[PDB]
Amino acid sequence: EAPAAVVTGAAKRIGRAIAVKLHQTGYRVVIHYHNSAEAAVSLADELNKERSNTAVVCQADLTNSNVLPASCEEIINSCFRAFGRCDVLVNNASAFYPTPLVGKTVETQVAELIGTNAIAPFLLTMSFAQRQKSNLSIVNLCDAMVDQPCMAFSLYNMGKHALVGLTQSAALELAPYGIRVNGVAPGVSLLPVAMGEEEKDKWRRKVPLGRREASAEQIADAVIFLVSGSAQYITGSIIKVDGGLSLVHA
Amino acid sequence: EAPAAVVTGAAKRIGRAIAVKLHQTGYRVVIHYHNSAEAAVSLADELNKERSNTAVVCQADLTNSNVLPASCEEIINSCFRAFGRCDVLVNNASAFYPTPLVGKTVETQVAELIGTNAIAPFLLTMSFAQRQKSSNLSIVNLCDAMVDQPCMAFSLYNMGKHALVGLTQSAALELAPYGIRVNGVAPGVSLLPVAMGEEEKDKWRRKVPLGRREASAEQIADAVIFLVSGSAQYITGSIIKVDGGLSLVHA
Amino acid sequence: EAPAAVVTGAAKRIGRAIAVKLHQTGYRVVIHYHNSAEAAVSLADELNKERSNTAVVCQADLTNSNVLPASCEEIINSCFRAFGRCDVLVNNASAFYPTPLVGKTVETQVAELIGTNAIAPFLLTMSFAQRQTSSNLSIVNLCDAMVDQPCMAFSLYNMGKHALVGLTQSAALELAPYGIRVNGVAPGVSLLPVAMGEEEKDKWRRKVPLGRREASAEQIADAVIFLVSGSAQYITGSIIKVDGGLSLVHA
Amino acid sequence: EAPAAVVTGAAKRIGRAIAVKLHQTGYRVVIHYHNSAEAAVSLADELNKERSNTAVVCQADLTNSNVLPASCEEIINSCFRAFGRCDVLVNNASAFYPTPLVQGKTVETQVAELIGTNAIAPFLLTMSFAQRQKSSNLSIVNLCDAMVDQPCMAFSLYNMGKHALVGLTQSAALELAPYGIRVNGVAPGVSLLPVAMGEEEKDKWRRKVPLGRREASAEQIADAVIFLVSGSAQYITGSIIKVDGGLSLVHA
């Protein structure tokens, strides 16, 4: 019978492309979402049309708070309830906005940016590992530019840095259970509607390999590799999918 | 006129040695503490005996909470009330204990470990810089040389230190326009717990290529002094390992 | 037409497994060898028995010398000669032995360790690029996961693998405009040879968090295959560890 | 008795600044040079004028060849001959020029010069330095490059050389730690620019640096060297200190 995967922030964009490829590969998927309820439901419908009873949605705010552990336990619980198993966790959900050092409160920004990008991944990893009853693995969506951070994005960058540490820490600690933990680190990918042709072009032009952004599917391809039987000896690795962007000096 | 430094968790061990060396170098010091009031005050008294009116203490919990930003603002404000200036911020205070993946709730652990190691440093950096909006202004973060060879069951602590690395780098870039340098010192094995069995202390000591011993607090403090000095005025965004080669040792 | 690949040091062990997988995926292949001519030829016989005229062999010493550039050009030429195209280059050939700091001369060791691990890959890279719509051109360098926790007495080997990292990154940048991707695969402990003592083999195996075993040659090859595939077409400058977590383990 | 130091490529620019600062701290110095004989002799003159019998010059090509090991052994031997000891080695000499991957010197000469100076000579010097040893504070400092993981276009061999030197720094730190010899590095970003560089190209480099939009002075680089050799760095080994004013942290 078919393995099962949770993908956080899977309603749209990169998380959706990850959910789609996992499903094409034969996974049953939990499509987690926060605000994008319509897109989530529509994706589950599309996927269930392809193979019945292979997709469910699961709503949760991944902002840090005293109930985040419960929410994260519930996401994993929702995979077992629907599919009787949980083979793969993809930590993709992520808040992203500037927090300059010099109308959300600063503690709300901390809770959002650090919760989504780091604490929730940690709690989800905890619950995933504890619920284990095979090719089990976790893939974290990191950031190829983590050591060349954008100006005024401190809290975001801190979250992505903690996510690197979690990836390495959990790889080590979960290895005795046969659970692999790895990361995929995009550079410029699927820039959204709808920043100017200006700023999109400015970022696309930085990319040595083709002067273009990654497609969502290109990011998903690397996730697919890491969860596959072709990556069974791979744990604690973070694969840049950045067309060489992080190698480019000032 | 004499520059001033805030050192967090400065009552004991490594932070104390940092505050002593800064004081010996000519700084006035805010000795921040959480639970260690008696040692904090004892340090302040010793330093004030050396030079009157050069050391004050400041108490705060640096666990993450709704009140942390105001607590951090108060710490910076306190250096300005005492000394009229704040030249140097040393983020040293840190909670440290295991949080295995498989008394305290996990969200408390998050609050303490990510609060002390990362969020408090960030809020302190904001407040420090906001107050600055021949001066040699800088921040030094106490990191961890073993951050990419993490210890078993220390994921939250490790996550905290990794975030601290990101902060060190992001703030270096963002504050460079104000002449504020931001750097780190990354100990390997330094001061071991008093209560740790000497036999267990020795398993750690034996891992260190250089001398098969832990770093003194003073050796950690030496790197901090360098980073804040006029000899490091082009250095920002750098994290100096002070680890006796430990991080280079394979399994 | 079927794409073609050059694999250096392909007669045995990891290079053989890479050659076989590329061939299984539909590539024609040049099996480069230095001393292992019998094994290179049995490999080509096997592969050509599956699909005719799809494997050839090519001999060369990859030690640095006055003739190395010409040898490297000839390797790439052998692929164009045999197959009309060269889509993939896998730099796998590598000399490996200790060079303590305190009967080959030291300069012969420099030539072999740095030649095979760094200089020949640079020259092969030059010749590969010089010879070049819907193509998928890439280079994969066999690096080393333990490059920043190097083994005692292996400075020149380690220097060579460090230089290969540099090449991987420099070449990814410089060849990107040509559509040529350049990536690395970094084993930890893989296919420990028959020669080595079993207690020393067991020591290395026991260090590996994921299964306390070495990687098979096929496991290393899987990562190579991924990197040369259409599934990695936005990936350049990346080095993928295939090490079962070994590099993450502290002293 | 005063300690002694070898500084490679020390006749001018950063290497000079290092030798001068070491000398001011109380070291006797061997000023190595290759082609800049006049500048080297002029430096030794000044230092000797400050304290008699405290500087000597030593000529050597550090291009890789089968006699490079002898040449490096002789550099260390010259420090012992002049001063009776050798406490500090600074590996500063370096060839630097592009070597484009797609199309003067043959490529094998370019390999020998770029990889020789930046990596192999440091290795051989380190071997000889350790081999010649018996409150000592023995150390090696390697001049690295903060941009090593964001390399400049068409500088493959140079970058390979600097990467190899990182590996040496790390490997030698571990292997020489038992002898009390620390090995560390200093990694400039943009420091002293070429005389001939057009001030427009110079300003393009300057404007990249977050801390001050200016290049590091030679003294700023030397300051980090001096820290690493001092008693204030006695637990530090295997460490590479960027002196780059934030440049390596700046994205494309």
Ligand SMILES: NC(=O)c1ccc[n+]([C@@H]2O[C@H](COP(=O)([O-])OP(=O)(O)OC[C@H]3O[C@@H](n4cnc5c(N)ncnc54)[C@H](OP(=O)(O)O)[C@@H]3O)[C@@H](O)[C@H]2O)c1
């Ligand atoms: N795009 C890039 O160029 C790029 C570059 C580097 C790294 N990455 C990383 O790659 C991953 C995917 O990137 P992306 O651009 O597709 O991400 P994105 O669109 O910015 O966000 C992905 C999803 O995260 C979810 N999310 C945000 N805040 C949340 C919260 N408080 N609780 C729960 N979920 C929340 C949202 O769900 P709802 O829509 O359901 O609210 C959102 O759709 C991210 O981890 C990102 O940081 C992307």
Ligand SMILES: NC(=O)c1ccc[n+]([C@@H]2O[C@H](COP(=O)([O-])OP(=O)(O)OC[C@H]3O[C@@H](n4cnc5c(N)ncnc54)[C@H](OP(=O)(O)O)[C@@H]3O)[C@@H](O)[C@H]2O)c1
């Ligand atoms: N010792 C080592 O081997 C080692 C190794 C690697 C890195 N480091 C780093 O170097 C630094 C110094 O190490 P250390 O061993 O001296 O540190 P430590 O003794 O564990 O902690 C230093 C101080 O942190 C303060 N602290 C802890 N929790 C706090 C909270 N919730 N709010 C406010 N302050 C709090 C405490 O102050 P009170 O006592 O006043 O409560 C404590 O004395 C730390 O950042 C540490 O992570 C140390």
Ligand SMILES: NC(=O)c1ccc[n+]([C@@H]2O[C@H](COP(=O)([O-])OP(=O)(O)OC[C@H]3O[C@@H](n4cnc5c(N)ncnc54)[C@H](OP(=O)(O)O)[C@@H]3O)[C@@H](O)[C@H]2O)c1
């Ligand atoms: N095995 C591991 O645990 C491990 C760990 C980390 C990294 N790696 C890397 O992964 C790659 C494959 O490892 P491996 O253990 O399979 O390699 P290996 O057996 O040591 O050597 C591979 C081949 O390299 C060729 N070679 C050696 N010296 C040469 C020279 N002077 N000129 C031309 N060719 C020469 C040999 O070809 P002939 O037999 O034809 O002479 C040899 O069969 C290497 O790059 C290695 O550094 C391996």
Ligand SMILES: NC(=O)c1ccc[n+]([C@@H]2O[C@H](COP(=O)([O-])OP(=O)(O)OC[C@H]3O[C@@H](n4cnc5c(N)ncnc54)[C@H](OP(=O)(O)O)[C@@H]3O)[C@@H](O)[C@H]2O)c1
């Ligand atoms: N300048 C920068 O912005 C910068 C940036 C990053 C890193 N660095 C590093 O910092 C160090 C000093 O930089 P720099 O600009 O002062 O260096 P440099 O002037 O390019 O070179 C220093 C010396 O190296 C010696 N040298 C060159 N080729 C040689 C050979 N074949 N044999 C022996 N010696 C040779 C030369 O000695 P003679 O003049 O006597 O012939 C030269 O004076 C270098 O290791 C460099 O890579 C500098």
Ligand SMILES: Nc1nc(N2CCSCC2)c2cc[nH]c2n1
């Ligand atoms: N969560 C998230 N979204 C991102 N987006 C969506 C908002 S606009 C630009 C791409 C990026 C980009 C780099 N890291 C990111 N992380």
Ligand SMILES: Nc1nc(N2CCSCC2)c2cc[nH]c2n1
């Ligand atoms: N990897 C990445 N890309 C970024 N870009 C390009 C993708 S879309 C928005 C700006 C930013 C911005 C802040 N941190 C970032 N990290």
Ligand SMILES: Nc1nc(N2CCSCC2)c2cc[nH]c2n1
């Ligand atoms: N640098 C470092 N040292 C550690 N040691 C040695 C010092 S005292 C306690 C254990 C630990 C433990 C978890 N993370 C650590 N990081």
Ligand SMILES: Nc1nc(N2CCSCC2)c2cc[nH]c2n1
């Ligand atoms: N905050 C903190 N405390 C530490 N302690 C606890 C008090 S005494 C033994 C060291 C260590 C050790 C490595 N990283 C650490 N971080």
Ligand SMILES: Nc1nc(N2CCSCC2)c2cc[nH]c2n1
């Ligand atoms: N070229 C090469 N061969 C290796 N071999 C063959 C000889 S014995 C150990 C496996 C190893 C091992 C780590 N890096 C290596 N590189």
Ligand SMILES: Nc1nc(N2CCSCC2)c2cc[nH]c2n1
């Ligand atoms: N990755 C790796 N493995 C090594 N091992 C384990 C494989 S077989 C021989 C020792 C060594 C030895 C020196 N450099 C090495 N690098």
Ligand SMILES: Nc1nc(N2CCSCC2)c2cc[nH]c2n1
């Ligand atoms: N040996 C060396 N020389 C350099 N010089 C002197 C010649 S022209 C360019 C500046 C630079 C510059 C960056 N890394 C360098 N390494």
Ligand SMILES: Nc1nc(N2CCSCC2)c2cc[nH]c2n1
């Ligand atoms: N650190 C650094 N600076 C560079 N610059 C700035 C200083 S002067 C010459 C160009 C170059 C050039 C090639 N590799 C370099 N590395």
